[PDB]
Design a binder for this molecule. Structure first.
Ligand SMILES: *[C@H]1O[C@H](CO)[C@@H](O)[C@H](O)[C@@H]1O
Ligand SMILES: [Zn+2]
Length: 163
């Protein structure tokens, strides 16, 4: 990673840390159905809420700015990826650099997505990609929604806002 890329990652890491902190606080204080929760995680029920609450509790504990970043990947369509059992290392690809720091499909949101994938943080899977698929997963299969990385990213980004 170049100096500029490291600078960009410092901004993205900070924003991702804030996304996770706010999302965790939101989950801790809302123990009933709300538009933001149901849209990304489906019908509210204690067990599922507990699952997502735990994911954000784990991600909140890790220092995003201390992750080991790798910028060798040049694949244009890919934002980033990680190996679940190789905690703390995040590989950035082409799309990551085109994405805005915050917002929809952002750098910060991408880090939240990847962070949730680490086994240490809960090991979310990729059952659905994109907002359309994520929302459909939440409505049709909540069990997998609370285990889908993109559903966490979109809940955190919260753009447009709902809460
Ligand atoms: C999630 O679903 C609930 C209904 O179960 C709504 O209150 C919310 O707007 C979101 O679509
Ligand atoms: Zn993923």
């Amino acid at each position: 990673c170049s100096s500029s890329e490291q600078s960009a990652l410092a901004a993205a890491a900070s924003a991702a840390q804030s996304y996770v902190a706010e999302s965790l606080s939101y989950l801790q204080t809302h123990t009933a159905a709300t538009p933001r929760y149901t849209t990304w995680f489906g019908s509210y029920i204690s067990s599922r809420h507990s699952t997502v609450l735990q994911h954000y509790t784990d991600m909140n504990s890790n220092d995003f700015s201390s992750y080991s970043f790798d910028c060798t990947c040049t694949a244009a369509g890919t934002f980033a990826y990680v190996y679940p059992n190789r905690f703390g290392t995040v590989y950035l690809c082409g799309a990551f650099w085109k994405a805005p720091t915050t917002g929809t499909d952002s750098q910060a949101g991408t880090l939240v997505h990847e962070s949730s994938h680490f086994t240490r943080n809960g090991g979310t899977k990729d059952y659905a990609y994109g907002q359309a698929a994520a929302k459909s997963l939440a409505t049709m299969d909540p069990d997998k929604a609370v285990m889908n990385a993109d559903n966490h990213e979109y809940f955190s980004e919260n753009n447009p806002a709902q809460s």
